[PDB]
Amino acid sequence: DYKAFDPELWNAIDAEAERQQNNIELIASENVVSKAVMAAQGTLLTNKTAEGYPGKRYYGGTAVIDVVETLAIERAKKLFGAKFANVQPHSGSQANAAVYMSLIQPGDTVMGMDLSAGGHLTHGAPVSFSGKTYNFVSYNVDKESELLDYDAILAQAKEVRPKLIVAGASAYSRIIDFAKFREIADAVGAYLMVDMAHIAGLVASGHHPSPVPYAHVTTTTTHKTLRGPRGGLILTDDEDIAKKLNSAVFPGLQGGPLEHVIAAKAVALKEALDPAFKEYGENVIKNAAAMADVFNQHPDFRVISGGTNNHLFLVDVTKVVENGKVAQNVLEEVNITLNKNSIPYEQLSPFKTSGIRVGSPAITSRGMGEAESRQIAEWMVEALENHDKPEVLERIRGDVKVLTDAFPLY
Amino acid sequence: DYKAFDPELWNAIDAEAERQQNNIELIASENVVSKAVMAAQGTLLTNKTAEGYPGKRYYGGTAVIDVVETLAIERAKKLFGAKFANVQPHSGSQANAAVYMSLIQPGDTVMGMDLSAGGHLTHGAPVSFSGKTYNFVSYNVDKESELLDYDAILAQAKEVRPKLIVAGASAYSRIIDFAKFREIADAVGAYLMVDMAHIAGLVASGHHPSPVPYAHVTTTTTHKTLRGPRGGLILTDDEDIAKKLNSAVFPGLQGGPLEHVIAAKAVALKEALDPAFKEYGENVIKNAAAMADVFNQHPDFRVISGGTNNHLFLVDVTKVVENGKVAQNVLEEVNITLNKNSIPYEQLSPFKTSGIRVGSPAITSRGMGEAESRQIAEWMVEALENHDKPEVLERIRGDVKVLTDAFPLY
Ligand SMILES: Cc1ncc(COP(=O)(O)O)c(/C=N/[C-](CO)C(=O)O)c1O
Ligand SMILES: *Cc1c(COP(=O)(O)O)cnc(C)c1O
Ligand code: NA
Ligand code: NA
């Protein structure tokens, strides 16, 4: 029993398999992967170094590695309708780094969705390599609708004359019109890159329009809505861009890939090609809307853009607690995890933020429904109304456990 | 079972576990991780995203993550005798990219060991971000002795005035004098970074002097001689540097870590703090020595530098086949995997090369010893001289099998 050898490691791996139990996970990014996926990542493909690409390895003994990677690649092309997939990127951050390195030059101009409006760090935060290597200019949503204004974005693109437009977000509730993004890119001579990391399982379930026919390159995490292992993926229909991408990922940015995690990508993409995955995304879409109803109705709150068509939404809580930092602090005490989150034209300071962010793929994968979500969101509006009242927060927490117990995990 | 849904994948895996029994693995980089290490990265810490560093997460629900990572950090610090450890890098390549980003500017001059003598891609190859972002200038071994010549490296450092010297290699058989490297760095006002990826388990076993007291920063894979999961690690004793390193890895280069890979780094780091790990490294040293003996004796074959004091060595072949490509092709035909390799002052093409590279760490992990190692080297001599006598190659194959059969894997 290897567990005997290292007791205090495998008993932190237990405080966690239980912290995941008695937690209500509403962090929009999170999910719960199959046993098939977790098992694949724990194979002895972690012993084999496979630098290069299938039938183009640096070394031999890579025949069987080539079969497994080729599956991931083909299942990705199939699921997303792309002519080329690269499955080696270690993360979404590496996937995106490889695209910048393939299409543009150090110092070129890049338009990205602002980190207020829900851009990733790697869509131009000055802390990130993205922000330091290239000249990132953000676009926002409209101040009153909180929707993408494609006319606004065009005018800005015409003045800024970016080489690359990144679309995709971590905090945007509504359907992105990728045909309009490609039309804006085309109007100014820019490449379009769509980071679909948040919506990729919705793109796979048929519930969100695919960026793949409109983006020059589409990047994604294989985790989040797509509910695969942590890692990255690049898709393109353009064979020249494919060649630059492949060269950018290896040996441009990376060495040997994590063939065990690639095995786990092949698995997650078979599960996403399953009819059952449409049900899942349908259930993801409702559970998020159900949950979102509750904040709209309540007078002191406000679901952002008045609602959601994907797996998530924001909320302005600055009428009920000092800031979203506080709102978040409060809700942990009750066994509810989600995140402080800027909101369009953020009032407060970055560390504080005017409100929270919710999503539904985690609770949805734990097999929960519309009742549960409404329930959870009442518990939230409750807890934030009564942030100063620990008898209350204690009563809510007893109840959170009622439900966590009720619904399992594996 | 899960294997039900996805045969094509799980029977590709089943099959790799067979190929890694029918194989003599002599690829110097490879090892055979424990069941504890696979098992641990095939757990459900993959579900949780842990942006930031212990007690400075972005999100809550961490805390039990903060304990698994704190374990890795503290095991790495105690195993290597370093004051600071960062266990977040996804790979050796991201570990190296994070040190460049912390210590030097784009365009800054860096001296690295020549790709031909053992330079890693990330030590300045023009096809790598390393080569493209910084001014890399390589040093080589002495032409006659095939040894690092520290008077020659200082003379070049005084001409080139690098901001950073990188010591460490993928194909060097001899003890590196890390104190001479830091003496040279100090003489020209340069940082010293050591990439100990290949030797990290011999540094851990006590069989290789440590870079940690002499390198401003030390990087490594957790895989290779350290026999951990695939990933990276950064060590320093300077607190100012550790702060810069930590920003550079996140949010500089990466997003959220593979906390399940990090769990499996805590596993491996405990397997290597164990008495038994010293015995492992001793057997690695003896095993490679045994194998290098055979090539010394035989007149047509020359071991580079005349021998080895670590886990690998290079053998020349261009008096007994066209090139090393042919060498490895022939050897694969017998169930012995290793790689072609440039030898110092390579004549032939990168794709062909005058040499093979041989390592003891995998076969040592399968509980093998000196007789076995000799046989393999005998076989590799037999086959390479009888390069087109397929009666021969097949007689060997059956013997290779007798032995691969004779020794287990798991
Ligand atoms: C000294 C050093 N640093 C970093 C890495 C990078 O390892 P990753 O692929 O980024 O995790 C390597 C790899 N080397 C090749 C294949 O193992 C090889 O054995 O020649 C290395 O030798
Ligand atoms: C969550 C997210 C990522 C995560 O990146 P990692 O490097 O895998 O942590 C990347 N891009 C986008 C748009 C995301 O929403
Ligand atoms: Na996803
Ligand atoms: Na190692």
Side-chain angles (χ1 to χ4, degrees), chain A residues 6 19 30 38 47 75 129 230 253 410, chain B residues 6 30 42 46-47 49 61 75 94 252 410:
Chain A
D6 205 336
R19 190 220 47 96
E30 304 286 23
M38 277 193 330
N47 291 330
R75 298 178 173 185
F129 73 98
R230 315 206 140 247
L253 286 172
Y410 290 95
Chain B
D6 199 347
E30 308 300 63
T46 195
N47 291 330
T49 134
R75 288 175 189 193
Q94 278 66 76
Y410 301 93

mmCIF file with all atom_site columns, all heavy atoms in Angstrom, chain A residues 6 19 30 38 47 75 129 230 253 410, chain B residues 6 30 42 46-47 49 61 75 94 252 410:
data_model
loop_
_atom_site.group_PDB
_atom_site.id
_atom_site.type_symbol
_atom_site.label_atom_id
_atom_site.label_alt_id
_atom_site.label_comp_id
_atom_site.label_asym_id
_atom_site.label_entity_id
_atom_site.label_seq_id
_atom_site.pdbx_PDB_ins_code
_atom_site.Cartn_x
_atom_site.Cartn_y
_atom_site.Cartn_z
_atom_site.occupancy
_atom_site.B_iso_or_equiv
_atom_site.pdbx_formal_charge
_atom_site.auth_seq_id
_atom_site.auth_comp_id
_atom_site.auth_asym_id
_atom_site.auth_atom_id
_atom_site.pdbx_PDB_model_num
ATOM 1   N N   . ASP A 1 6   ? 3.389   7.382  2.221   1.00 0.00 ? 6   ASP A N   1
ATOM 2   C CA  . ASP A 1 6   ? 3.213   8.865  2.294   1.00 0.00 ? 6   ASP A CA  1
ATOM 3   C C   . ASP A 1 6   ? 1.854   9.172  2.914   1.00 0.00 ? 6   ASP A C   1
ATOM 4   O O   . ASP A 1 6   ? 0.904   9.532  2.223   1.00 0.00 ? 6   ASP A O   1
ATOM 5   C CB  . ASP A 1 6   ? 3.417   9.516  0.917   1.00 0.00 ? 6   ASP A CB  1
ATOM 6   C CG  . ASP A 1 6   ? 3.840   10.977 0.934   1.00 0.00 ? 6   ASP A CG  1
ATOM 7   O OD1 . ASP A 1 6   ? 3.567   11.695 1.952   1.00 0.00 ? 6   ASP A OD1 1
ATOM 8   O OD2 . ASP A 1 6   ? 4.449   11.403 -0.095  1.00 0.00 ? 6   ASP A OD2 1
ATOM 9   N N   . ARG A 1 19  ? -13.581 18.392 0.818   1.00 0.00 ? 19  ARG A N   1
ATOM 10  C CA  . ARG A 1 19  ? -13.829 19.845 0.667   1.00 0.00 ? 19  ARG A CA  1
ATOM 11  C C   . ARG A 1 19  ? -14.619 20.057 -0.627  1.00 0.00 ? 19  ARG A C   1
ATOM 12  O O   . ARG A 1 19  ? -15.407 21.025 -0.663  1.00 0.00 ? 19  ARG A O   1
ATOM 13  C CB  . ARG A 1 19  ? -12.551 20.671 0.625   1.00 0.00 ? 19  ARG A CB  1
ATOM 14  C CG  . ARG A 1 19  ? -12.785 22.173 0.717   1.00 0.00 ? 19  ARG A CG  1
ATOM 15  C CD  . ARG A 1 19  ? -11.879 22.951 -0.217  1.00 0.00 ? 19  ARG A CD  1
ATOM 16  N NE  . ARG A 1 19  ? -11.877 22.361 -1.556  1.00 0.00 ? 19  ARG A NE  1
ATOM 17  C CZ  . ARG A 1 19  ? -12.634 22.754 -2.577  1.00 0.00 ? 19  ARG A CZ  1
ATOM 18  N NH1 . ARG A 1 19  ? -13.488 23.760 -2.445  1.00 0.00 ? 19  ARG A NH1 1
ATOM 19  N NH2 . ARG A 1 19  ? -12.527 22.126 -3.737  1.00 0.00 ? 19  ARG A NH2 1
ATOM 20  N N   . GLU A 1 30  ? -15.048 26.005 -13.112 1.00 0.00 ? 30  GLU A N   1
ATOM 21  C CA  . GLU A 1 30  ? -14.762 24.676 -12.503 1.00 0.00 ? 30  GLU A CA  1
ATOM 22  C C   . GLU A 1 30  ? -15.650 23.623 -13.125 1.00 0.00 ? 30  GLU A C   1
ATOM 23  O O   . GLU A 1 30  ? -16.665 23.988 -13.706 1.00 0.00 ? 30  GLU A O   1
ATOM 24  C CB  . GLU A 1 30  ? -14.943 24.719 -10.987 1.00 0.00 ? 30  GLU A CB  1
ATOM 25  C CG  . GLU A 1 30  ? -14.084 25.787 -10.337 1.00 0.00 ? 30  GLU A CG  1
ATOM 26  C CD  . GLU A 1 30  ? -12.607 25.427 -10.278 1.00 0.00 ? 30  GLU A CD  1
ATOM 27  O OE1 . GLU A 1 30  ? -12.191 24.587 -11.111 1.00 0.00 ? 30  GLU A OE1 1
ATOM 28  O OE2 . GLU A 1 30  ? -11.880 25.975 -9.385  1.00 0.00 ? 30  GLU A OE2 1
ATOM 29  N N   . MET A 1 38  ? -9.812  11.175 -15.211 1.00 0.00 ? 38  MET A N   1
ATOM 30  C CA  . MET A 1 38  ? -8.888  11.111 -14.052 1.00 0.00 ? 38  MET A CA  1
ATOM 31  C C   . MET A 1 38  ? -7.981  9.877  -14.156 1.00 0.00 ? 38  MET A C   1
ATOM 32  O O   . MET A 1 38  ? -6.812  9.979  -13.768 1.00 0.00 ? 38  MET A O   1
ATOM 33  C CB  . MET A 1 38  ? -9.651  11.083 -12.729 1.00 0.00 ? 38  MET A CB  1
ATOM 34  C CG  . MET A 1 38  ? -10.069 12.455 -12.259 1.00 0.00 ? 38  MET A CG  1
ATOM 35  S SD  . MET A 1 38  ? -10.647 12.521 -10.542 1.00 0.00 ? 38  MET A SD  1
ATOM 36  C CE  . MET A 1 38  ? -11.322 10.865 -10.389 1.00 0.00 ? 38  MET A CE  1
ATOM 37  N N   . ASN A 1 47  ? 5.595   8.241  -18.439 1.00 0.00 ? 47  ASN A N   1
ATOM 38  C CA  . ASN A 1 47  ? 6.996   7.754  -18.511 1.00 0.00 ? 47  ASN A CA  1
ATOM 39  C C   . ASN A 1 47  ? 7.572   8.069  -19.896 1.00 0.00 ? 47  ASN A C   1
ATOM 40  O O   . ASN A 1 47  ? 8.821   8.165  -19.999 1.00 0.00 ? 47  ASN A O   1
ATOM 41  C CB  . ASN A 1 47  ? 7.109   6.268  -18.153 1.00 0.00 ? 47  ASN A CB  1
ATOM 42  C CG  . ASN A 1 47  ? 6.826   5.990  -16.701 1.00 0.00 ? 47  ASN A CG  1
ATOM 43  O OD1 . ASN A 1 47  ? 7.077   6.828  -15.847 1.00 0.00 ? 47  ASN A OD1 1
ATOM 44  N ND2 . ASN A 1 47  ? 6.283   4.821  -16.400 1.00 0.00 ? 47  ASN A ND2 1
ATOM 45  N N   . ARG A 1 75  ? -10.678 13.384 -32.793 1.00 0.00 ? 75  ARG A N   1
ATOM 46  C CA  . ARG A 1 75  ? -11.881 13.644 -31.966 1.00 0.00 ? 75  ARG A CA  1
ATOM 47  C C   . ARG A 1 75  ? -12.078 15.159 -31.829 1.00 0.00 ? 75  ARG A C   1
ATOM 48  O O   . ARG A 1 75  ? -13.233 15.598 -31.896 1.00 0.00 ? 75  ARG A O   1
ATOM 49  C CB  . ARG A 1 75  ? -11.761 12.892 -30.639 1.00 0.00 ? 75  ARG A CB  1
ATOM 50  C CG  . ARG A 1 75  ? -11.698 11.377 -30.823 1.00 0.00 ? 75  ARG A CG  1
ATOM 51  C CD  . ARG A 1 75  ? -11.540 10.653 -29.509 1.00 0.00 ? 75  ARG A CD  1
ATOM 52  N NE  . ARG A 1 75  ? -11.643 9.209  -29.660 1.00 0.00 ? 75  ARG A NE  1
ATOM 53  C CZ  . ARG A 1 75  ? -11.644 8.358  -28.639 1.00 0.00 ? 75  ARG A CZ  1
ATOM 54  N NH1 . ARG A 1 75  ? -11.552 8.806  -27.399 1.00 0.00 ? 75  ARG A NH1 1
ATOM 55  N NH2 . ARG A 1 75  ? -11.746 7.061  -28.863 1.00 0.00 ? 75  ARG A NH2 1
ATOM 56  N N   . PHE A 1 129 ? 2.682   37.821 -19.914 1.00 0.00 ? 129 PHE A N   1
ATOM 57  C CA  . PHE A 1 129 ? 3.572   37.897 -21.114 1.00 0.00 ? 129 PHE A CA  1
ATOM 58  C C   . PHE A 1 129 ? 2.821   38.566 -22.284 1.00 0.00 ? 129 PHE A C   1
ATOM 59  O O   . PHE A 1 129 ? 3.371   39.467 -22.927 1.00 0.00 ? 129 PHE A O   1
ATOM 60  C CB  . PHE A 1 129 ? 4.054   36.503 -21.537 1.00 0.00 ? 129 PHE A CB  1
ATOM 61  C CG  . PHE A 1 129 ? 2.983   35.669 -22.186 1.00 0.00 ? 129 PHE A CG  1
ATOM 62  C CD1 . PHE A 1 129 ? 2.900   35.586 -23.567 1.00 0.00 ? 129 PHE A CD1 1
ATOM 63  C CD2 . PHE A 1 129 ? 2.000   35.050 -21.418 1.00 0.00 ? 129 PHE A CD2 1
ATOM 64  C CE1 . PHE A 1 129 ? 1.882   34.856 -24.163 1.00 0.00 ? 129 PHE A CE1 1
ATOM 65  C CE2 . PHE A 1 129 ? 0.977   34.325 -22.014 1.00 0.00 ? 129 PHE A CE2 1
ATOM 66  C CZ  . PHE A 1 129 ? 0.919   34.237 -23.388 1.00 0.00 ? 129 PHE A CZ  1
ATOM 67  N N   . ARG A 1 230 ? -7.218  19.487 -17.286 1.00 0.00 ? 230 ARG A N   1
ATOM 68  C CA  . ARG A 1 230 ? -6.475  20.757 -17.448 1.00 0.00 ? 230 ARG A CA  1
ATOM 69  C C   . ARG A 1 230 ? -5.417  20.621 -18.560 1.00 0.00 ? 230 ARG A C   1
ATOM 70  O O   . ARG A 1 230 ? -4.554  19.729 -18.481 1.00 0.00 ? 230 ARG A O   1
ATOM 71  C CB  . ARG A 1 230 ? -5.764  21.193 -16.174 1.00 0.00 ? 230 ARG A CB  1
ATOM 72  C CG  . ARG A 1 230 ? -6.592  21.083 -14.908 1.00 0.00 ? 230 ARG A CG  1
ATOM 73  C CD  . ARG A 1 230 ? -6.163  22.055 -13.814 1.00 0.00 ? 230 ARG A CD  1
ATOM 74  N NE  . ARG A 1 230 ? -7.427  22.480 -13.292 1.00 0.00 ? 230 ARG A NE  1
ATOM 75  C CZ  . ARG A 1 230 ? -7.940  23.692 -13.385 1.00 0.00 ? 230 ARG A CZ  1
ATOM 76  N NH1 . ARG A 1 230 ? -7.259  24.711 -13.896 1.00 0.00 ? 230 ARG A NH1 1
ATOM 77  N NH2 . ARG A 1 230 ? -9.146  23.871 -12.889 1.00 0.00 ? 230 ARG A NH2 1
ATOM 78  N N   . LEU A 1 253 ? 7.575   26.833 -27.744 1.00 0.00 ? 253 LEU A N   1
ATOM 79  C CA  . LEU A 1 253 ? 7.157   27.259 -26.373 1.00 0.00 ? 253 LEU A CA  1
ATOM 80  C C   . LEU A 1 253 ? 7.371   26.132 -25.382 1.00 0.00 ? 253 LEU A C   1
ATOM 81  O O   . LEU A 1 253 ? 7.647   26.430 -24.223 1.00 0.00 ? 253 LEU A O   1
ATOM 82  C CB  . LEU A 1 253 ? 5.703   27.749 -26.361 1.00 0.00 ? 253 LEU A CB  1
ATOM 83  C CG  . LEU A 1 253 ? 5.493   29.128 -26.988 1.00 0.00 ? 253 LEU A CG  1
ATOM 84  C CD1 . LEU A 1 253 ? 4.015   29.468 -27.129 1.00 0.00 ? 253 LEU A CD1 1
ATOM 85  C CD2 . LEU A 1 253 ? 6.183   30.208 -26.161 1.00 0.00 ? 253 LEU A CD2 1
ATOM 86  N N   . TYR A 1 410 ? -18.979 11.227 -6.979  1.00 0.00 ? 410 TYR A N   1
ATOM 87  C CA  . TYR A 1 410 ? -18.489 10.101 -7.828  1.00 0.00 ? 410 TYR A CA  1
ATOM 88  C C   . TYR A 1 410 ? -19.128 8.775  -7.386  1.00 0.00 ? 410 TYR A C   1
ATOM 89  O O   . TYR A 1 410 ? -18.969 8.330  -6.254  1.00 0.00 ? 410 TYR A O   1
ATOM 90  C CB  . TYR A 1 410 ? -16.951 10.062 -7.828  1.00 0.00 ? 410 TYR A CB  1
ATOM 91  C CG  . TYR A 1 410 ? -16.272 11.197 -8.564  1.00 0.00 ? 410 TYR A CG  1
ATOM 92  C CD1 . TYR A 1 410 ? -15.846 12.336 -7.902  1.00 0.00 ? 410 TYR A CD1 1
ATOM 93  C CD2 . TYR A 1 410 ? -16.067 11.141 -9.934  1.00 0.00 ? 410 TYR A CD2 1
ATOM 94  C CE1 . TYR A 1 410 ? -15.239 13.387 -8.578  1.00 0.00 ? 410 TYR A CE1 1
ATOM 95  C CE2 . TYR A 1 410 ? -15.452 12.175 -10.624 1.00 0.00 ? 410 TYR A CE2 1
ATOM 96  C CZ  . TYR A 1 410 ? -15.039 13.310 -9.949  1.00 0.00 ? 410 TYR A CZ  1
ATOM 97  O OH  . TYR A 1 410 ? -14.435 14.338 -10.632 1.00 0.00 ? 410 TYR A OH  1
ATOM 98  N N   . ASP B 1 6   ? -15.092 3.674  -24.139 1.00 0.00 ? 6   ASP B N   1
ATOM 99  C CA  . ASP B 1 6   ? -14.009 4.098  -25.069 1.00 0.00 ? 6   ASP B CA  1
ATOM 100 C C   . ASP B 1 6   ? -12.989 2.975  -25.220 1.00 0.00 ? 6   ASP B C   1
ATOM 101 O O   . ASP B 1 6   ? -11.900 3.040  -24.664 1.00 0.00 ? 6   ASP B O   1
ATOM 102 C CB  . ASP B 1 6   ? -13.379 5.395  -24.550 1.00 0.00 ? 6   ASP B CB  1
ATOM 103 C CG  . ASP B 1 6   ? -12.595 6.192  -25.575 1.00 0.00 ? 6   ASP B CG  1
ATOM 104 O OD1 . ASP B 1 6   ? -12.302 5.653  -26.667 1.00 0.00 ? 6   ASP B OD1 1
ATOM 105 O OD2 . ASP B 1 6   ? -12.299 7.362  -25.269 1.00 0.00 ? 6   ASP B OD2 1
ATOM 106 N N   . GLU B 1 30  ? 14.412  9.206  -19.786 1.00 0.00 ? 30  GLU B N   1
ATOM 107 C CA  . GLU B 1 30  ? 13.229  8.453  -19.318 1.00 0.00 ? 30  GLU B CA  1
ATOM 108 C C   . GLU B 1 30  ? 13.494  7.870  -17.946 1.00 0.00 ? 30  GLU B C   1
ATOM 109 O O   . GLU B 1 30  ? 14.677  7.631  -17.582 1.00 0.00 ? 30  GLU B O   1
ATOM 110 C CB  . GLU B 1 30  ? 12.846  7.312  -20.257 1.00 0.00 ? 30  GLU B CB  1
ATOM 111 C CG  . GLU B 1 30  ? 12.685  7.734  -21.704 1.00 0.00 ? 30  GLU B CG  1
ATOM 112 C CD  . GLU B 1 30  ? 11.634  8.792  -22.004 1.00 0.00 ? 30  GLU B CD  1
ATOM 113 O OE1 . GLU B 1 30  ? 11.769  9.935  -21.501 1.00 0.00 ? 30  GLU B OE1 1
ATOM 114 O OE2 . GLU B 1 30  ? 10.724  8.487  -22.804 1.00 0.00 ? 30  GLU B OE2 1
ATOM 115 N N   . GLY B 1 42  ? -3.841  11.100 -11.290 1.00 0.00 ? 42  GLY B N   1
ATOM 116 C CA  . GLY B 1 42  ? -5.153  10.555 -11.698 1.00 0.00 ? 42  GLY B CA  1
ATOM 117 C C   . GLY B 1 42  ? -6.210  10.637 -10.596 1.00 0.00 ? 42  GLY B C   1
ATOM 118 O O   . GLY B 1 42  ? -7.161  9.815  -10.619 1.00 0.00 ? 42  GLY B O   1
ATOM 119 N N   . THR B 1 46  ? -7.435  17.792 -10.037 1.00 0.00 ? 46  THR B N   1
ATOM 120 C CA  . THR B 1 46  ? -7.594  18.342 -11.408 1.00 0.00 ? 46  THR B CA  1
ATOM 121 C C   . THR B 1 46  ? -8.843  19.245 -11.453 1.00 0.00 ? 46  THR B C   1
ATOM 122 O O   . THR B 1 46  ? -8.788  20.279 -12.173 1.00 0.00 ? 46  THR B O   1
ATOM 123 C CB  . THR B 1 46  ? -7.609  17.202 -12.421 1.00 0.00 ? 46  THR B CB  1
ATOM 124 O OG1 . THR B 1 46  ? -7.411  17.735 -13.732 1.00 0.00 ? 46  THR B OG1 1
ATOM 125 C CG2 . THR B 1 46  ? -8.879  16.392 -12.352 1.00 0.00 ? 46  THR B CG2 1
ATOM 126 N N   . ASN B 1 47  ? -9.887  18.923 -10.659 1.00 0.00 ? 47  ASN B N   1
ATOM 127 C CA  . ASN B 1 47  ? -11.171 19.679 -10.635 1.00 0.00 ? 47  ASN B CA  1
ATOM 128 C C   . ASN B 1 47  ? -10.885 21.090 -10.129 1.00 0.00 ? 47  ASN B C   1
ATOM 129 O O   . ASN B 1 47  ? -11.582 22.002 -10.554 1.00 0.00 ? 47  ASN B O   1
ATOM 130 C CB  . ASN B 1 47  ? -12.273 18.905 -9.894  1.00 0.00 ? 47  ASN B CB  1
ATOM 131 C CG  . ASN B 1 47  ? -12.669 17.699 -10.710 1.00 0.00 ? 47  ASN B CG  1
ATOM 132 O OD1 . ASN B 1 47  ? -12.577 17.770 -11.939 1.00 0.00 ? 47  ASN B OD1 1
ATOM 133 N ND2 . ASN B 1 47  ? -13.085 16.601 -10.075 1.00 0.00 ? 47  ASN B ND2 1
ATOM 134 N N   . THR B 1 49  ? -9.003  24.773 -9.523  1.00 0.00 ? 49  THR B N   1
ATOM 135 C CA  . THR B 1 49  ? -8.078  25.821 -10.031 1.00 0.00 ? 49  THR B CA  1
ATOM 136 C C   . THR B 1 49  ? -7.706  26.752 -8.877  1.00 0.00 ? 49  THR B C   1
ATOM 137 O O   . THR B 1 49  ? -8.607  27.224 -8.137  1.00 0.00 ? 49  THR B O   1
ATOM 138 C CB  . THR B 1 49  ? -8.559  26.555 -11.305 1.00 0.00 ? 49  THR B CB  1
ATOM 139 O OG1 . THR B 1 49  ? -8.426  27.981 -11.246 1.00 0.00 ? 49  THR B OG1 1
ATOM 140 C CG2 . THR B 1 49  ? -9.982  26.271 -11.683 1.00 0.00 ? 49  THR B CG2 1
ATOM 141 N N   . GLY B 1 61  ? -11.864 27.874 -1.299  1.00 0.00 ? 61  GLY B N   1
ATOM 142 C CA  . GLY B 1 61  ? -12.016 26.421 -1.534  1.00 0.00 ? 61  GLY B CA  1
ATOM 143 C C   . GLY B 1 61  ? -10.663 25.756 -1.778  1.00 0.00 ? 61  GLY B C   1
ATOM 144 O O   . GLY B 1 61  ? -10.615 24.619 -2.317  1.00 0.00 ? 61  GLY B O   1
ATOM 145 N N   . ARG B 1 75  ? 9.147   19.856 0.784   1.00 0.00 ? 75  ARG B N   1
ATOM 146 C CA  . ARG B 1 75  ? 9.960   18.690 0.375   1.00 0.00 ? 75  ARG B CA  1
ATOM 147 C C   . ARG B 1 75  ? 11.100  19.108 -0.591  1.00 0.00 ? 75  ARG B C   1
ATOM 148 O O   . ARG B 1 75  ? 12.256  18.698 -0.371  1.00 0.00 ? 75  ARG B O   1
ATOM 149 C CB  . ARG B 1 75  ? 9.023   17.622 -0.169  1.00 0.00 ? 75  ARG B CB  1
ATOM 150 C CG  . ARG B 1 75  ? 8.217   16.992 0.962   1.00 0.00 ? 75  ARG B CG  1
ATOM 151 C CD  . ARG B 1 75  ? 7.178   16.008 0.490   1.00 0.00 ? 75  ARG B CD  1
ATOM 152 N NE  . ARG B 1 75  ? 6.305   15.600 1.586   1.00 0.00 ? 75  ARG B NE  1
ATOM 153 C CZ  . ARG B 1 75  ? 5.457   14.569 1.523   1.00 0.00 ? 75  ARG B CZ  1
ATOM 154 N NH1 . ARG B 1 75  ? 5.340   13.836 0.420   1.00 0.00 ? 75  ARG B NH1 1
ATOM 155 N NH2 . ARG B 1 75  ? 4.731   14.263 2.588   1.00 0.00 ? 75  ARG B NH2 1
ATOM 156 N N   . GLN B 1 94  ? 8.857   25.730 -19.287 1.00 0.00 ? 94  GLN B N   1
ATOM 157 C CA  . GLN B 1 94  ? 8.229   26.875 -18.565 1.00 0.00 ? 94  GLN B CA  1
ATOM 158 C C   . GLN B 1 94  ? 9.107   27.256 -17.366 1.00 0.00 ? 94  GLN B C   1
ATOM 159 O O   . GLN B 1 94  ? 9.374   28.472 -17.150 1.00 0.00 ? 94  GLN B O   1
ATOM 160 C CB  . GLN B 1 94  ? 6.757   26.559 -18.232 1.00 0.00 ? 94  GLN B CB  1
ATOM 161 C CG  . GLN B 1 94  ? 5.794   26.801 -19.404 1.00 0.00 ? 94  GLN B CG  1
ATOM 162 C CD  . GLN B 1 94  ? 5.993   25.871 -20.585 1.00 0.00 ? 94  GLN B CD  1
ATOM 163 O OE1 . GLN B 1 94  ? 5.613   24.696 -20.563 1.00 0.00 ? 94  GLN B OE1 1
ATOM 164 N NE2 . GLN B 1 94  ? 6.557   26.392 -21.664 1.00 0.00 ? 94  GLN B NE2 1
ATOM 165 N N   . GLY B 1 252 ? 2.785   35.835 -14.975 1.00 0.00 ? 252 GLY B N   1
ATOM 166 C CA  . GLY B 1 252 ? 3.723   36.097 -16.083 1.00 0.00 ? 252 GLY B CA  1
ATOM 167 C C   . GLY B 1 252 ? 3.537   35.137 -17.251 1.00 0.00 ? 252 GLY B C   1
ATOM 168 O O   . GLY B 1 252 ? 3.400   35.620 -18.347 1.00 0.00 ? 252 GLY B O   1
ATOM 169 N N   . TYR B 1 410 ? 5.900   -3.186 -13.561 1.00 0.00 ? 410 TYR B N   1
ATOM 170 C CA  . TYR B 1 410 ? 5.016   -2.934 -12.393 1.00 0.00 ? 410 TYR B CA  1
ATOM 171 C C   . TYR B 1 410 ? 4.336   -4.253 -12.010 1.00 0.00 ? 410 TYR B C   1
ATOM 172 O O   . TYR B 1 410 ? 4.670   -4.838 -10.990 1.00 0.00 ? 410 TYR B O   1
ATOM 173 C CB  . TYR B 1 410 ? 3.980   -1.845 -12.703 1.00 0.00 ? 410 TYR B CB  1
ATOM 174 C CG  . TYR B 1 410 ? 4.487   -0.475 -13.105 1.00 0.00 ? 410 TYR B CG  1
ATOM 175 C CD1 . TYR B 1 410 ? 4.653   -0.126 -14.437 1.00 0.00 ? 410 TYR B CD1 1
ATOM 176 C CD2 . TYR B 1 410 ? 4.703   0.516  -12.160 1.00 0.00 ? 410 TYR B CD2 1
ATOM 177 C CE1 . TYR B 1 410 ? 5.047   1.149  -14.822 1.00 0.00 ? 410 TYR B CE1 1
ATOM 178 C CE2 . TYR B 1 410 ? 5.116   1.787  -12.524 1.00 0.00 ? 410 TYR B CE2 1
ATOM 179 C CZ  . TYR B 1 410 ? 5.290   2.115  -13.859 1.00 0.00 ? 410 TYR B CZ  1
ATOM 180 O OH  . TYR B 1 410 ? 5.715   3.373  -14.217 1.00 0.00 ? 410 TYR B OH  1
#
